Amino acid sequence: MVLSEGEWQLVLHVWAKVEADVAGHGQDIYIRLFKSHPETLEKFDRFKHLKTEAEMKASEDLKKQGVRVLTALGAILKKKGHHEAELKPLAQSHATKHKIPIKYLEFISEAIIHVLHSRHPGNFGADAQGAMNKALELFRKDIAAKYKELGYQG
Numbered sequence: 572m573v574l575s576e577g578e579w580q581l582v583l584h585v586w587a588k589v590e591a592d593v594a595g596h597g598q599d600i601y602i603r604l605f606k607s608h609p610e611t612l613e614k615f616d617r618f619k620h621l622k623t624e625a626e627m628k629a630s631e632d633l634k635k636q637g638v639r640v641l642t643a644l645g646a647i648l649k650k651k652g653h654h655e656a657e658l659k660p661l662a663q664s665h666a667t668k669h670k671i672p673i674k675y676l677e678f679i680s681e682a683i684i685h686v687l688h689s690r691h692p693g694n695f696g697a698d699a700q701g702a703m704n705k706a707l708e709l710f711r712k713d714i715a716a717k718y719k720e721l722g723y724q725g
């Protein structure tokens with residue numbers, strides 16, 4: 572699949588707003604992910620002990636992790652589809668070390684869309700959401716392909 576320049580513009584326009592507060596968006600996304608799909612928390616040995624949203628918001632380590640995640644995703648989105656190099660290390664670690672199924676990548680994609688919709692309604696109308704969904708679907712499609720090459724069914 573391929574996004575048009577117009578669709579990429581919608582994606583990068585709202586992403587520019589996210590970048591005004593990377594740490595805050597990361598926390599919101601994780602909290603949404605862990606509350607909606609608790610099973611995903613079990614994959615994080617360093618955070619699986621967190622019991623409440625309050626503890627999650629107070630975790631300095633979780634905040635730092637969120638920044639790393641959004642920074643990596645932002646770098647990929649900014650490549651506008653030409654992300655082969657960026658995807659390699661990410662696919663290898665998540666398939667071989669962390670063992671993250673594609674289903675969980677779908678769950679975090681849902682959390683990202685939920686948070687953007689909540690925080691940036693003016694820059695996340697129907698067309699913008701459609702573009703972001705398309706960008707995330709492309710990301711998941713390419714990661715899934717790499718997973719297969721690496722020997723992980725995902």
Ligand code: HEM
Nearest residue numbers: 611614615617639640643644660661664669671675676679
């Ligand atoms: C938006 C998609 C995602 C991106 C861009 C992303 C990115 C990253 C990055 C950059 C790291 C640090 C370096 C590395 O180990 O590769 C990382 C670590 C990790 N990721 Fe992800 N990730 C994503 C989704 C997920 C999901 C959905 C899960 C599981 C529910 C997950 C589980 C982990 C774990 C367990 C670690 C290691 C954390 C630690 O060091 O304690 N990731 N991720």
